[PDB]
Structures are given as structure tokens and as C-alpha cells.
């Protein structure tokens, strides 16, 4: 019954918290806020997630230790990494990874830390939930790998390598840690992404709305 | 009180558990077991995260919020990136950044993230304490900044980034993200680390001779740190 929703951009929090149209009290916790309410008999707790893997790794494991979360939807903006793959296309990841890791020191493949997976998995359940949504909306919904790093991605000899070593269709900052705390404490997560690059600000006031409306869909049904 | 104390691998915690001599409660949460024990009227609690940042991150939140740690406590190895930083040396960290943070691309400088800063300090009073213990029994103990990252550093290039961008003593893959949680929480933090290898091109090579005595170099002296507690 309770579900985190976290969203990696923070302008989106308030579209989402106004959307639900009940009370949310505010409770800081960890150098963040998080927002608590309750919608037809379930707990909804809403962050913004911060930036980068360490923030978003903060937010994730604060949100099910202290909130007891058991589900959690997180929303965002992706850089596409393949030319079918436009701006506005709504992506859903299937697996994540975090590109940066390396222990080739090691002889480790690339993305792999021992006692861990290269590969991090998402749930099945939502997934097929923000797809049934998708369809109902008439929306293309399509699904492929998420790569994470704490690097804005911009050259084209790293996104030839997200695509090459981890067959990555796009790429973001936060994904792969926020799926990773979920899978760690069996929480089923859905990672959905807006492809951002292939006005920002624009597109953001507009993706943010739909997002939260996107979200709120899926809590519907939950 | 409530003390956490904290390694990457479970060859950094083996030497802590010995040394303490009590019996532990493992318990598990999150993907880690914590060693919760009784040692002096303290309640101690002990885990290896498992290597890098959302390994330490987690572990570290899972610590403080599920185990109501006051301090904590982090010991284990690390790769120096000067020259009076020799194998088993110990270093106490003052600062540390995540040298691999690149906003550049938004103009930011390396390691920086917005609500945040490139360095992050650690616990005035536990570093001081450190520093009174190594003086009274002669062991030699630096102070100075840690780089920590994703990426084990094996490369002279990747050293001298980190000694000129950040003016870095040694490099890991914790030390900055259990310092940042224990910061966002209010929690006194101490990271210290003896050295393992150089972080160059052999530094796989010296890690694997090295990981078991520096180990318990830091191990022994976090131990000497809580006697003091």
C-alpha cells in the first residue's frame, strides 16, 4: 500500500504533490524532504531524489528505511543514445547499469563489483503497468537499457562505449542507483525515463506535467 | 552510546571483529549483515558495504537510520599518491571529494554537485583524537585529503589528476560517500586507511600482497580508537 514516487528532476515534485490534491506534511530527513500523504487509503511519500549516484543511493535507502516504502516509480529526464530512440519518446528500463564502475584493475569487466551484478533489474509488475498506461493513452512506450554515472555524457567516444560494452539505449545519473537500493531491499521499482536530447526549459514545464499525470495513473491502478 | 564501525570488503572487518573478542548478532538488512555487539558499555556495530559508492552510501544510511549509530567509524585500505605515503602507512582523512563527479559539461568544476561542495570534512573531534593517540604510542599518522571514486586507480596519468586537481594524498572508493551520509545526518565520521599499493600500473599486484596486514594496520588503530571512547 505504501509507494515512493521519486523524481530526478525537483521542479517535478510540486506538479506531482498538486496532482494527488490531498494534504502532504513535509518532513526533512538526511539534508532532504520528503512528502507524505495519504490517497485512497494508501501512504504516498514523494522526493526529489538530488543529483548524482550518491544523493540518489541517500534518498532511496531513506525513503524504505524510514518510510517503509514498497514500491517505488522514479521519473526523469535520458540522453538517447540511438537515433530511433527521439526526443519526447518515453523509455522504461528494462535492466540498468552503472557505466563509471571500473575494477579493470582487477581484471573485472567493466560495470561488475564483486559480491554485485553488472546488470540491475527492474520490476516486471510496473513495467507492464506503465505499459498498459502507455497503451491506454495511445503513448509509445519504449523499453531498453538505462546507463547511470556521475558524468553528463556528451562525447561521442563515451556514448559509442555506453552502447558497445552495456548495449545502453540511453543514459542518465540516477537510474542505476535508485533501481540498485530498491533491488537490495526487495522493493519493486520502475524506472521511466523522457528523452531529453538526441526549449529545455519547455520541455521540462510540459514533461513535468505529463510525468506527474503519467504517475498518478499508475498509482491508480496500484 | 552507539558506535558504527565500517569497511568496504570483509577482509577489512575480519581483523575488527577478532580484535574486539566479544559475540556478535548478525543481522541482516539491505543486502549487508551488520555484527551488532557489545564491547564496554558500548554497542557496536559492524559491516563491510561492499566496494564503491551506492555500496557505502546505502550501507552507511542503513547504519544511522536502522541502527541508530552516534559515530561511525570507517577503516580499510587505500592506494597512495605521494611519496611519504609508503605501504601499511596510516592516513587519517581531514577532507574528502568524489574525484569522479564531472559536471563540467554545466560549466561546474570536477567533483562538484549542485546542494553540495567539492570537499567534505570529517569528525574535528575523532581526528583529533586520532592524532593524540598516534603521537603517545610513535606511530606515524598523516592527515591530509582523500580521493574516492568508482574506478580503482591504477594509472600514473589518473594520479596526477587527483594530486593536482584536488591536492589528494590517497584514493579509494568509500571514504567520500560514508563522509557525505554521515554529514547529511549529523553523525561524527572518521575515515582512516592504511596504504595497500601506489595506485599505479602494479597497484592490483601490491593490493593483493598488502590487503591482509594493512587491513589490520587500520583495524588495530580503530580498535585503539574506540578503547579510547
Redesign the interface.
Known amino acids: 500500500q505504501k509507494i515512493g514516487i521519486l523524481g530526478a528532476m525537483r521542479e517535478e515534485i510540486t506538479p506531482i504533490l498538486e496532482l494527488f490534491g490531498v494534504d502532504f506534511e513535509e518532513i526533512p530527513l538526511?539534508?532532504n524532504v520528503f512528502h507524505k500523504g495519504v490517497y485512497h487509503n494508501k501512504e504516498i511519500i514523494v522526493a526529489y531524489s538530488?543529483?548524482?549516484?550518491?544523493?540518489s543511493?541517500?534518498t532511496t535507502?531513506?525513503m524504505?528505511?524510514?518510510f517503509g516504502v514498497q514500491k517505488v516509480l522514479f521519473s526523469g529526464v535520458a540522453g538517447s543514445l540511438v537515433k530511433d530512440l527521439k526526443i519526447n519518446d518515453l523509455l522504461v528500463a528494462t535492466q540498468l547499469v552503472?557505466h563509471?564502475?571500473?575494477?579493470?584493475?582487477?581484471?573485472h569487466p567493466l560495470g561488475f563489483?564483486?559480491?554485485?551484478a553488472i546488470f540491475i533489474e527492474t520490476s516486471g509488475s510496473l513495467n507492464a503497468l506503465a505499459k498498459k498506461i502507455a497503451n491506454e493513452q495511445h503513448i509509445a512506450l519504449k523499453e531498453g537499457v538505462i546507463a547511470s554515472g556521475?558524468?553528463?555524457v556528451?562525447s561521442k567516444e563515451r556514448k559509442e562505449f555506453l552502447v558497445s560494452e552495456f548495449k545502453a539505449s540511453a543514459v542518465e545519473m540516477e537510474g542505476?542507483?535508485v533501481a540498485?537500493?530498491c533491488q537490495?531491499?526487495g522493493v519493486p521499482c520502475c524506472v521511466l525515463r523522457s528523452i531529453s536530447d538526441n526549449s529545455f526549459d519547455e520541455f521540462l514545464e510540459k514533461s513535468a506535467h505529463t510525468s506527474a499525470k503519467f504517475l498518478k495513473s499508475m498509482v491508480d491502478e496500484l
Not at 50 to 55: L, R
Not at 113 to 116: A, D, L, Q, T
Request: charged share 20%.
Open positions: 538526511g539534508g538530488k543529483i548524482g549516484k550518491v544523493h543511493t541517500l535507502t531513506s524504505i528505511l524510514a552503472q563509471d564502475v571500473d575494477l579493470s584493475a582487477f581484471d563489483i564483486p559480491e554485485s556521475d558524468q553528463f556528451h542505476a542507483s540498485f537500493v537490495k531491499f
